[model samples]
Each structure stands twice: as C-alpha cells, then as structure tokens.
Target: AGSRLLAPLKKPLIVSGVLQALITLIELAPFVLLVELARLLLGGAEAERLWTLGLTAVSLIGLGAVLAAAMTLWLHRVDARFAHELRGRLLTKLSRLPLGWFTRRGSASTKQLVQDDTLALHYLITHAIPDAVAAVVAPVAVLVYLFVADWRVALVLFIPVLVYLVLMSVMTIQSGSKIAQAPRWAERMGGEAGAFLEGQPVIRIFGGAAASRFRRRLDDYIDFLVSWQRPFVGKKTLMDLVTRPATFLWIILVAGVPLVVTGRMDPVNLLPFLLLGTTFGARLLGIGYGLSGIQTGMLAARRIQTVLDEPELVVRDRTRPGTVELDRVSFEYRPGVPVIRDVTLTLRPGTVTALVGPSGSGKSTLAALVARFHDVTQGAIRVDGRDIRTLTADELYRRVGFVLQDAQLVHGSVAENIALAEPDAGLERIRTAARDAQIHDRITRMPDGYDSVLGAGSALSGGERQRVTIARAILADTPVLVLDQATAFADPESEYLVQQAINRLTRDRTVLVIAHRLHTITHADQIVVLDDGRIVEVGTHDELLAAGGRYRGLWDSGR
Candidate 1:
C-alpha cells in the first residue's frame, strides 16, 4: 500500500517524488525564514534585511514552480508510454491464448478489460497514486520542520488529522462489501450493453419490440447500482464530520489557550499552530479523494491479472510443410458432455475434405481441431507428422486460413481488409487475389475503388464481404484451409459468388469444409459424415448416397 504500484515505471515516480520534496522544502524554507525574520526585526535589524529575505523566498518558489511544471510534463508522457506498452503486452498475451477462450466468455467481458480497466491502472499510477503519495510525504516534511521550532504545538498537530484519517478508513470499510460487488455487476452490465448494441439494427427494423429487452437490462443495472450505493450513504457524513473547520479551531483554542495562560508560550505562537492545522487538514482531504480511485484500481488490477496470468496454448514452431491427421480425437466443452469423439481422420495434403452433418454434429468442431482453436481433451492432432501439441498455435494459424458463416470486416478499406493476412501485400497482388475470388469486378466499380471505407458509405453485402474474406485467404495463400459453413447464411443471389470464392480458396490445398447443406460439399473429394461426435460415413457423394445410412437420412431430411 505504501510503495509505488507500477514498479517498472518507478523511475518516473522517483523523479516526481524528488520534485515534490523540493517543492515542499522550498515552501517550508520561506516559512522558516519568516519566523527567523520576525526575531531579527524584534532585535532591531535593518529593514533592508527583511526585503532580502522576502526576495530570496520568492526566488525559491519561482524555481520550485518550474520544477513542478517539468515534473508534470515528464510524468504525463511516461505514464502514457507505460499505458501503451502494458496494453501491447496485455493484447499480445490474449492473442496467444486459445481462440476458444473468446467463445467461452461469449465476448464483452474481455472488451471491458481493455476499454475500462487499463484506464484505471493508468490513472492510479500516473495521477491518483503520485498525488496520494505526495499528499502523505509533504505534510510529514512540513510537520518535521515545524517541530524543530516548537514541539508543544507540532506534537499535538496530528490529533485532529489522524482522527480524520481513521474516519476516512471507516468510510471505505463500510462500503467494502458493496465495492467488492462492483466489478461483477460491471462485467455483466458490459455483456448486456454489448448485446443491446449488437442487436440494435435488428431491433430498429423489427418495430422496436426488442427495445424492451435492452431497456429492462439498463434499468436493472441502475437498480443494482442504486442498491450498491446504499451502504455509502454514510460516507460523506463521516468525511464532512472529520474535516470541519470548527474541529481544528477547537483543537487550537483548547491547546494554545492553556500554553498562553500558563506563560509556557507567547500568544503569537497560536498563529503558526492554526497554519499547521489548515495545511495538514488539506493533505488529509487529498488522501480521501485518492483512496476512492485506488480501491477501484485494486479491483481492476485483479481483473486484468486474470488475463495476464491465464494459461497460454504453449507449443513449438515448425519450418516445414503441412499434413493434418486427427487420430481418435475427442473433445468436450465440459465433463461427461463430449461434442467431438474418437473420430480418426486425415486431411491429406493438396486435397479438399468435406465434413457434413445435422446441426450439432461436430462438423465445425472437427475443423476447429485442425486449426487448434482448442486442444483435444483426448487423442492427438498432428501437423507435418508432428503432434499439434508440439507445433506452435501461430504456425498453424499462419498455415491455415478460415472463412466462417459471417465474414468479419474491420473498419477499413477493401484493399486493407484483403491485405490483413499479408500486411505487406501490394495493390497488384491484392487485386489479383480479388480477381481469383471473382470479387474484383464488384470492387473496381466503386468510385473509391479498393480505397472504399468499410462500415461507412461503402459497406458491402454479405456476399461481397464473404468474397473479400476468400480473397484474404487467397492472399494469405496458406497450405491449409477451413471453410466453416461459409455459404450457410448467403442469399440465393450471393451463394453463387460465395461458392465461386470458396472454389478459388480451396483449390489444391489441404481443405476441410463444414456445411449443413449437402450440396455445398458435394464436390469435395471425400465427404465425412459426423453424427454426435463420431464419423459414421466416409466416402464420395455417390458412395454415401448408395450406402443409405445416416448421411442419406440427413440429405433426405434437408431436402
């Protein structure tokens, strides 16, 4: 609680500390000179000596003012740098985490970590913490300098402020139960907010009936906050009671009146004691403000540590080509609930393998395994004859590109979207990849052409976005591909473009296609039919058709 929070940036804090000490010392020096000057004037010293002392104190304050400004400017940039580097580290670690972790939380909880929590850390280290610290040390230095002159007054100086401090502590302790509940409610509230925004367009189009769901959640959150704030109703009452001007006025009158009446101190000594009360009281008031921010920062830090310390999909790298073999693979989201079972399969190099089944048949899960979204609960998935456990997740990611049912588009230009997989891709290469996916014709017709901004005036249709994704895979030119239900959501008009794009992306590669529509995977070199995590049928369309087994039933049912 006493030492600086961000150890890595203690250099900035140390500089800030030194600057605060210098400012406090400079301020205290003038007060000391004023006391000394009062004695010298009583001893009949010349009036010119008074102006000399006054000018000297003014000069020290001016110098301290410049140092304070420089300290602020330095900490501001250093704090910003600390925030940037920490954000980068946090993001890079999250990137290395298993892809399925995203699905497990289902989304917005993670977004809130970066959006809200990191800012809390930055504020704690940069401003709240620095000021909180100076608030403590400055008064101690002032009090010590005061004590060197008069112990009787300086000794009792801490009584009112410490009483004030104990009350501040009590206020936080009273709210501790409610403060502990803050993060949980905030995480859920973020989920509700995210859901509302994601469904906003639909809600707007559908006569606004869904608006009730969003409003209900918003009202619920407000009610929860109201309940949480109830414990803190006494907080301000305790704080105001502590720092009342009357409290310290009584302390001075009671203590100083005794010393003056008994002739142990002069009446003028009361002036310095009153000044001490005001300065120390001012410092405690600052501590109260910082205590609040630091409490939330402490909780936010714990939330961030969950991400930083979360387990990574640790594995090794590969410099060779690809071969994916799933041997007796089984997976489950939870115990005793297997979604992918002991299914032995191989996606041979330079071949297109299709996986088809009814809903929840593990078609997507099987493809997800080859991509190593999550490691198997049992069995082994191998790449280039090496177990996927021995191969780095990034290696597999770079080698395999996927196009899902919904194409994810960033707020960027058409060329930038396609170049995501190949950051250094040139315009010619980008256009060529687009042409290969049959999307170049649509792209070039725009006045902005490849420069058209996404999510703005140049938003694309689902078909065009899917094709752009296919172009990304083409540009990535990965040896392994997963077409995870790419055409499942396409319109009749867009299905042709989507399938054509899929055709270009899957040509002469290790491809695994997952689809519900049997026709979408009909041209696959080999079709694997999965039912309840086991592969029941494995052959071409004609072979499976003749078998008249589960595949035949699914094909018939879908028809």
Candidate 2:
C-alpha cells in the first residue's frame, strides 16, 4: 500500500485529499445553518418557501464529505501497500547477501536494518504520510474556501498563516542538523547496547571492576544523549512559545476585518466564516507540529536509505546449473594479499573431500568459496561444470549446505531450529538426522523432548548445538556440504561422536571440511595445505607429511 501510494500519485493525491477534506469540513458549516433555517421555516410557515434552498445546501455538503473520505481512504491504502512490498524485497535481499558483507559492516548494523529500520518505515507509512496529506491539502482547501466566502477576510487571515509557515520553515532548518544528529547517536547507542548484551557473560566472568566499567560506560552514553538533546528541545520549545501568541493576535485582527468590511454582515454566513477560520487556524497549528517531527523522521529515513542502498556483494544468476566446482581459485579479504591462492579442487557426486590446514591458512575461505559466500578474485568457481556466477541464488542455496564454526541457534525449540533449513521435513527424518548427529539423546532427555526450547535458560551445550546444526544440514540433504571447523569447540568425547556422525552423513555427498584439529582429518582422502593464502601442498595426508614442507612444519609446531 505504501509503495503503490508513494509510487505514482503520492504527491498529488495526498495534497488533493487533505485539501478537499478541509474544504468539505468548512462547507459543512453552511449546510448546518441551512438545516437550522429549514427548521425555522417549518415552525413559522411564513418562510416555507426557503426550504428548497436549505435542502440544496445540505445535499451538496454531504456529497462533498463522502468524496473527501473516499480519497483519504484510497491514499492511505496506497501508502501501506507500498511499504509492505518494499520491506519484503529488503528482507529477501538480506538473506542472500554475502558473508563478507556481514564481516565488514558487522551483524549488529544489519540487525538494526531488519528491526529498527522496518519500524521507521512503518511510521512513515502510517503516520507521516497521512499527516503530510492533511498539512498540505487541508490548509489550502480552508484558505480557498475562506477567499470564496469573503476575499477581505481571507486576505487578512493570510498574514498569520504565512507568518506561521515562514517561522516553521526557519525553525526546521535551524533544527535540521540537530535532528539529523539524533539517529546517528541512536545507531551508536544501539550498537553499543548490542555489544554490551552479547558480551554479558564475559563481563560477568571478569567480576566487580568489569561490571562497574560497563555501568560507567552506559551512564556516560546516557549523559551524552541527554546533552545532545537539550539544545534541540530548547529550540522546539521556543518555537512554540513564539508562535502561540502571534497566532492569537492574527486571529483577533482578521476577525475584525470581515466585520468592518461588510457593515451589516449576514449573521449566518458570518458565523460559518468565523467558525471555519478558527478551525483553519487550529489546522495550521497541526501543520507546524507535523513539520517539527518530519525533520527527525526525514533524518531517520536517510539513515535507512543508506543501508538500503548498500551494494549487494553477492547477487543471484539465473543462467547456470546448481552444482559447485572450484578451478585454481584465489581470493583475499584485502587487495594484493591472497587468502586462498592457486588452488584447484573438484567436488563430484557421492564423494566427501575434507580440507585440513593450520589456523589463518584459508581452509574456511575455501569452504566459503564452494558456497559462493565470497567470489574468488582469481580463477573461477562453477556449478555442474558451469560457472557459479551463472546459477541463480535459489539454485545454489538449494544444492549447497553450509555449517559454520559456531552453530548459531535462534531463540526457539530444538525442532524449530533443526527444521529451519527445511520446515516441512518429516518427523521420522528429523529424528533420524538428530540421532545421526548425536543430539537426539540429549534432546529427548529434556522436558519438551523434540520440542524443547534451545536458547537462554534452555541453552544447549556447545556440542549439542553443533549436533543440532549438523542435524539441520542432514535434513537439508543438499548435494554439497561445506563444514567449517564443525568440531572445533567440542570436548574429545563429543568431538569423536560428531566426527563419526559427519562421516556417516557425508557418505554419499560431496563434502568440504575446514579441518583444524589433526585427529579430525589425518585420514582424509586428500589434504590441502595453505599458507598466507597460497597453496603450499595438496595430497593425501601421508603424502604431504612425507614431502616435509609447510604442512610438516605446521604439524611439528603442534598448530
């Protein structure tokens, strides 16, 4: 609704609807008087001839009111629909974005875009747009009606409205910088709060001094917020103070002009003008109020637009098949410095290949490349013999399964978490996958069993969460699996179990494991050694060790 309304007829419809509503309201006063006149004619009988005039006035007023209301409803619906569609597109794009984008910009900022930015868009659609319509349309409609009723009265009233507008514009400009600064401060506050919350366990482990430091930082942030707001608040208050008195003076002056210009003014017509003028003045006040907040909203919108305009690092291609392969691939987070260099690898059907390397040696980058998380700056990655860049995003994701170092579980039940990748996975399949991942025993022991909540107080152990993620991957059953340090955090007993489960799960699948622990990949069919982003060695583990180069050195160092 919001998008449709904003897309084509936004400016004109909003302006016209607001103006018509105000005009129609003003015209209503004359109809009310006409009804009263009809009553008078009926009571006196001598004025019966005036009933037609009264009836005509009432009909026109009712028709105008219905038209105004219809337009208002149509404009509102358009605004709402537009915002909904735009938000959906943003969410879809967010899910398909590259891992590097999150690494560079941080997850907290992306979270803000999904949460706070969506809220800001909601406000714009629901309140700002409607208020803007009224501010523009209603006042103009009222002014025009007044001029038609009595030009002198309209001309006299124009002074106050014009003054109010000029003052509001000046005040808005003066407050613009301050208003703009608010959201930046807000974003900072949000980022800090997110960091603080995420680090709560660490902070608590550090004891009293750390707790006090955290509190002090929070207090300081609060103080800064208050200090920044003081000037903007003062300016807003002063604007109100000055405008109120000026408005009263203008109303008094304008009221006298109409009475003086038409010495014997018709009381009925005069009454409508007096009432409409007062109502119009109030609407002017509403306009000022809306304008004041609009500056702040506009600032928020600009911030939101910044995130919306960020380049999509990874975009889907709809031209190729959904099978992934790597050919002499090389990449780096920074330029001129390779992380995975001159490495050629094949991922074929019904085969599992593990990657084992020392820390900071690009094993994870290799796994990421298979999933097209980051495009290789050198060489090419393909799906089913076709370049990955040629395949659609949906196709790539459908065929590829990715499990990270730390398996993140959202606040939900164990079943929900497992079913995240495939919501409609059958209960039997879910159970089988869970058992294979070695988490079924732990989950079944819980009060809710398969439905057990798995976050916060219901927290799964590190090993349990890893298994849960593994279960998810199994449920997905994609053609390709990329496991990055899957057992890095598990204890020996849990690690052994997870390793066994992985071997079972990858029996007939093309698998790429970013192996860090020696025990996990000593028997891998092939081992690729990377150093400073370059492939130093690639062969069976025994072959690499027998060759005695960087792999042997890293192995000897116990890294």
Q: Which candidate has the top score in TM-score?
A: 1
Q: Which consecutive 10 residues in model 1 have the weakest lDDT in total?
A: 1-10
Per-residue accuracy of model 1 over 1-559 as CA lDDT, tens digit each: 2133366767777767777666656655665666656666667788899888778867876776777687778788887887788688778888868776787775777777776777777556666655765677767876776677567877676786677778778877876777777777777878877776677677788758545476787788789777767556566556665666567667767877888898998866666556444555555666675676777777777777777778987775542365688899999877799999898998877678888887888877777777777789889988778887776766677777777656888888889999988778999999999887778998999889999888744578767787888788788887888888876656665677657765765666788888887877788889998888899889999999999998889888889
Q: In model 2, what lDDT does residue 528 have?
A: 70
Q: List where candidate 1 sits over 4 angstroms from the true fold.
A: 1-5, 10-19, 38-45, 127-159, 205-211, 224-265, 317-322, 456-458, 490-507
Model 1 — TM-score against the truth?
0.87
Best by lDDT: 1
What local lDDT does model 2 show for residue 469? 93
Would you estimate the TM-scores of all the predictions?
0.87, 0.80
lDDT tens readout by residue for model 2, 1-559: 2343234546755675466555546555554455456455546755454666666666777766776576657656765665567578668776666677778766667766666655565445445555565556555765686677766556766666667677777766766675666555566666767766777777677764456455665677778667655664665565465445455445645576457666744444454345455544454555566664655545445655665666665544555233456788888877877777778777666655667666787877777787777878889888777677776777777888989877899888888888888888888888988887888888888998888777666687777788899888888888788888887767888778877877777777777777767657887766777676766678877787899987777678776
Model 2 residue runs over 4 Å out of place are: 1-5, 8-75, 121-159, 207-274, 292-310, 313-324, 334-337, 348-352
